[model samples]
Target chain A: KPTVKEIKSLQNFNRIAGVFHLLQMLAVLALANDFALPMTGTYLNGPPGTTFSAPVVILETPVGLAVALFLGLSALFHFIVSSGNFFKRYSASLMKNQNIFRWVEYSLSSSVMIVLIAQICGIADIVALLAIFGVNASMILFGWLQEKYTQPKDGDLLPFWFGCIAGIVPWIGLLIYVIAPGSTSDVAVPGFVYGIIISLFLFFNSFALVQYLQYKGKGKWSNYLRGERAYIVLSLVAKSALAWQIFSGTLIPALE
Target chain B: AKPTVKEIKSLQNFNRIAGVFHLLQMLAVLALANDFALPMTGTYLNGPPGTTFSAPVVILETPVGLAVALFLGLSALFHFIVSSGNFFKRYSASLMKNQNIFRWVEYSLSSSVMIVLIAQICGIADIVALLAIFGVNASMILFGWLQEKYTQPKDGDLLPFWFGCIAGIVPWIGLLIYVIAPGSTSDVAVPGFVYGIIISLFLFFNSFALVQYLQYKGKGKWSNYLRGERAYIVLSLVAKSALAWQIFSGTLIPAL
Candidate 1:
C-alpha cells in the first residue's frame, strides 16, 4: 500500500495530464507556421554553399503544426485512458495499459524531438532523419519491454541498459554537430539552441534517473508511484521546453 | 449559513482579493508607462522594388500595452464593486452558479480579443470566419453554464463538459487551418513577438477548463469548492499579468 502522499501525487495523474496536454496544444496551435530545419547532405559534385557540400537542401519541417498534432495526440491518449471503461480497466489491471500508452506516446513524441534536434543540427538527409527516429523509438520501446517482461527480483535490466545505449547515440551525434568546425561555420547555430541541448539533455536523463532510483529502492523514490509522478512531470517539462524553445528560435520573426 | 460562507463573505478576505486586483492594475499602469516613455525608432526600405530607398521615419505608435491596462483596470473596478456592503451581501447570497461576473468579463474581453488577434495573424479579414470564430468560442463559454445547470448530485455525466470541449476545439481548429494550410495566410505584417503572446494567451485560456475539471471531478486540493474558486481568482491575475507584461516587452519595447 502506498502512503497518503504517494497516493495523492499519483491520483488522477492521467486525467489531470490530459488537461495540461490540451492546454499545450493551444499554444502550439496559435504559433503554427513554417519551421525550416536546415539539412546537410554529402554529394560528390554538389552545389556550393551547402552545409554538407559543402551541399545540402533546407527542409521546411512544418514543425509548428507537427508539435500541435503531437500534443493533441497525447491529450487524446490521456483522455482515453482516464475515462469510463478504459479508466476502470486501467485501474483494475497491473497498470499495463497505462505503461503501454506511455511508451507509445514517447515513441512518437520523443523520437520527433530527436529528429527536430537532428534537423536543427544540420542532419537533413532523409535517411539520417529516419535512422535517428528509428533509434529513438527503439529506445522507448525497450523501456516498454522493461516494464512488460520483468519485476525487480529478476535482476534483468537489459532492456533498460540497452535503451540507454541507443538513446545516447543521438545526443552525442548532436554534440559533435554543435562543436564540429565545418558544421558550426556553415549553420551558425544560435546560443539558444545550445541552451536547448543542455536543458533537454538533463530532462531526458531525469526520466532514467527517477527509474533507477525507484529500482534501487532509494529514499523517497522507493515508491514506484513516485517514479510515475516523476515521469509525468518530466514529460511535461521536456515537451514544453523543447516546443517553446523551437518556437522562439524558428517560428518567431526576428524583431529588433 | 455555512461556515465556508462566513470566510468567503468576510471583509478581510474581500480586501485581499481587491488588493490583488489593485496590484495588477498598478502593474498594468507601469507597463503602459514603460512602453510610452521609452520608444524605439527604426528605418525601413520603401518605394518600388528597383527604386527602393532607405529613409528615416519616426511615428508615435499606439502600444498594445494600453489595451492591457484597460483589461486590468476594468477587473480592478469590478473587484472594488463587490467590495461594497450591499453588493457583497447579494454576491455571497447567490447560488454562485452562473452569476460569476469576473468570468463573463474575462471570456468576453480577453478570450475574444485573443481570437481577433489570431485571426489577424492568419490573414482572416472576412467577417464570416471571424463571426463564426467568435460564435464557437462564445458557445464554448456558454457550455460552462450548461455544465453547471445540468450536473446532478445523485447521477451525473460530464456530457456538457465534453460538449464545451467540442465547441472550444472548433475555433482553435478554424484558426489553425488558416495558419497551417498552404497559401492560406495573406501578406499581413505581424511582429515575431505576437507569436509568443498568441501561444501564451491561448494556453492561459484553456487552463480555465483544466481548473474547472479539477473542481467538477473533486480532484485533490480542488475537491474544496472554495479552493477551486480561489484557483480561478489566482489564475485570472496570473494570466492577465502575464499577457500585460508580455505585450509590454514584446509588442511595445523594440530596443528598451
Candidate 2:
C-alpha cells in the first residue's frame, strides 16, 4: 500500500507537470505566430501601392493572446490548488489547511469559469471558439467526474458509463457542428452548437455532482438515480435547443 | 432499490446508440470517397470526339480499402457482441450477466486495439492518420485512468498508458519518415512546419495522458520526473530530423 505522503507528492508533481505542459504549449503558439506567413494581400490593407504596416506581434489578435493568457493562468492556479489540497489532506497538522484548500479550490474554479465565459463571448470565429470551449468543457467534466465518482471511496462501477457519457458529450457536439451545414458559414452556428452542448453536459454533470455531494455523508442509490434522470432531461433539452439553432440557420437570410 | 427492467433498458439504449455511432463513422469514409474529385482525361466510347472519359466509380486503392474494411468489420463485430450481451443481460434475467458483459467489453477493447494497428499500417497523410490514432489512444488512456482510479478492485492504469504509448510510437515513426525527405520536394515548408507543430501537440497530449494515468493509479512518480527531462530530448530530435530532411531534399532530384 502506498503512503498518503507519496500520493500527495505525486499529485503535486502531476500539477507541476501540467503547468510545464501549458507553458510549452504557449511557447509553441508563440513560435507559430512568429513564423506565420500570411498570404500577401489576403487581409484588407491600404489602397494599392500604399504600404500598410503593423507590428510583428507574437499573436495576430488580442483574442489569441487572451486565450493563451487564460490557459497559462489556469494551469498555474491548478498547480496551486492541487498542491494545497494534497497538503491539506496529507501533510496538514493544522485545521486551517482545510479552509485554505477550500478557498483555493473555490477561487480557481471561479476564475476558470470566468475565463471560459469570456472566451465564449468574446471570440468571433465560431469553429475556433467551439474547439476552445470543447477543450475547456472536457477539463471541467473530467474534474467534476473525478470528484463525484473517484473521491471519498472507490468501487462505484455503476456510474462508469455515466462518466463516459459526461466526458464524450461535448466532443460529440463538436463532431455534429463540424458536419452540419454552415459550420463554415459566417454565422455563429459553431458557437451556438458548442454553447448548447457545453450547457447540456454541464447541467447533467452538475445534477450528478449535486446528488453525489448530497450523498457525501449518505450514499443512496435512489438519489443517484433521481439525479441522473434529472440531468438526462436537462441534457436532452439543451441538445434540442442546439438542433433548433442549427436548423434555424438555414431559414435566417441574414445568417446566410 | 433493485436493478429494475427500466434501468436495464437504459443500458440497452446505450448499446444501440454506440452501435449506430460506429456504423455512421464507418459510412463517413464513403463520404470521403465521394468527395475525391480527381478529373480524368481518356477516350470515351459513348461520347463525341474530344469528349473526355471520367471514372464512374471512386475506389480506394487496395491497401487503404483493406485497412478500412478491417476497421469496419471489427467495429461491427464489437457492436454485435455488445448488442447480444445487452439483450441477454436485460431480457433473460441472466445470472451470468457479468460474463456476457465482460465478453462484450473484451471484444470492444480488442477491436479498438485492432483499429489502432490498422491505422498505423495505413499510409495516409501523417497529420490525419496521426490525429485519428491520437484520438483513439487518448480515449483509451482516459478510460483506463477512470477504471484504475474509480473502479474499485483497482486494476493498474500503467498498462493502458503503456499500450497508448506503443500505439503512439508507430505514428511517431511514420512522422519521422514524413519529416525525412517528405516523399516530395514540392511540399511547402510552411505546411510542414505547421504539421510539425500539430504532431508536437499530439506527442505532448499523449505524454500528458500517460503522466495523468500514472498519477491516478498511484505509481511511477519517478518515471514522471524522468519524462520532464526527456521532453527536451524529444524536441531536439524533432528539430534535428526536420532540418536534416530539408537538407536532404535540397540535394535530391525532384520526384513529382
Candidate 3:
C-alpha cells in the first residue's frame, strides 16, 4: 500500500493532468465554433480568394473558458478529496473512492483526444491543435509519472498509454500530410484515413481499459499491469517517430 | 421499504417514461440534421413562370439519412433495455452497481435538448417546429398513458406536462401564422388571426393538461386510471386541428 505522502503526490499530479485536459477541451470547443462560421474572403493576386485562416478565436472563446473552468474545478475537487487519502483516511468503512477521480481523468483525456484529432485534420485549425497538444502532452507525462511513483505495483498501464497515444496521433498524421506533397489538395483522404485509424485505436484501448477497470474490482492494481503501460509507450513511440518526420519536413524544402 | 408489486409497477412506469424520452430524442435528432442542412427553404416561392425544380443531393446525403439511422438505432437500444425490465425490477441493487446508465440518460437528454433548441432558433427549415411538436406529443401520449396505468404514487409529473406542451405548441404557432395575413404576399392573409387564436387555445389546453398530471402522482384513483381514453382524445384533437387548418390554408385560398 502507498504511504500518505506518496498518495498525496499522485493526487497532485492528477490535479495538473485534469487542468491540462480541461485546456484541451476548450481548444476543441473553439474549433467546433470556428467551423460553424462562414470562411472569410481574402484578396490574393488581385482577385478575391477564399482563404481559410486558422481560427484564432478558438483560443479565446466559450470553448476555452468552459474547458478551463471544468479542469480547474475538477482539479480542486480532486485535491480536496484525495488530500491525505482522506476518503480512506477518514472512513475505513468507505473503501477507497479514487475511482471518481479516475473516471474524470479518463473522460477529460478521451474528449481531448477526439477534439485534437478534429483540429489536426484541419476540420478545426492549428491554434486549437497546438493548445490541445500542449495540454494532452502535459497530462500524459504527469499521469505516467504519477503511476510510476505512487502505484508501482499497479499493473494496468492502459490509461497512461491512452494518454500518450492521444497526445501524439495528430502530430503523426500531420507528418504524413507534410511528406506526401500533394496531400493538402486531397485534404479529405488524409483526414478520413487518420480519423478511422485513430478512432479504432481509441475504441479498442478504451474497451480494454474499461474491462480491466471492471475486473480489477474497479481499483485493483494487478489489472493495471496487464498491457496498459506497454500500449501507451508503443503509441507514443509511433507518434514521436512521425513527429520527427514532421520536424524534418518543416526544416527541409520538398524536392520536386 | 421492502420491494412490493406496486414498486415493480412504478419502476415499469418509469421505464416507459424513459422509452418515450428516447423516442423524442430520435425526432430531435432528425430535426437537428434537417436544420443543419437547409434553412428557410420551406416557404412557397414565386420564381420564373415555368421553371423546373432541382433538388440538391448534398441536402439528402448529409443530414437526413445519418440522423434517421442514429435515432433508429438508439430507439431500438432503449426499447430492448426497457423491455428487459430486469434492471428496473432490481433498481435498488443495480443503482449501487450500474448507476452509470442513469447518468448517461440524464446527460444525453440534456445535450440533445440543447442541440434541438439551437436548431430551432436558427430557423433551419428541415427540422421545423411542427416536427418537434409531433415527436414530443407522440412520446408524451404513449408514455403518459403507460405511467398512468402502471405506476403508483407518481412523484414526478413534469414529463407528461412537457410532452403536452410540445404537442400543442407546434400547431398553435402554425395557426398563428395561418391567421395572420400571408406576410409573403399582399393580396390576402393566407392564414387569418382567427385560426391563430384557435390553435393558441388548443396549445393552452394542452399545457393545462400537462399541469394537471403533476397533481395525479400515480396514486389512489390515478394508479388505476388507464389513460387509453385520454390518449385517443389527444390524438383525435391533434389530427382534426391539423387537417382543418391545412384544408383552409391550402385549398380554400386561390393560388397566388
Collision count of model 1: 1
By lDDT, highest first, what's the ranking?
Answer: 1, 2, 3
Evaluated with TM-score, which candidate comes out highest? 1
Model 1 ranges with Cα > 4 A deviation: A1-11, A38-59, A92-98, A181-188, A253-256, B1-256
Off by over 4 Å in 2: A1-130, A133-222, A241-256, B1-256
Question: Model 3 chain A — which ten-residue stretch has the worst lDDT?
Answer: A40-49
- Model 1 misses residue B162 by how many Å? 37
Question: Chain A TM-score, candidate 2?
Answer: 0.36
Better of 1 and 2 by DockQ: 2
lDDT of 3 by residue, A67-113 (tens): 33334444454455446656464233122222334334434544444
Residues forming the 10-long window of minimal summed lDDT in candidate 1 chain B: B41-50
Q: Residue B163 of model 3: what lDDT?
A: 33
DockQ score of candidate 3? 0.05
Clashes of each: 1, 0, 17
Per-candidate Cα lDDT values, in order, are: 0.56, 0.35, 0.35
B115-154: candidate 2 lDDT, tens digit per residue: 3332322222112232333343444445444443343222
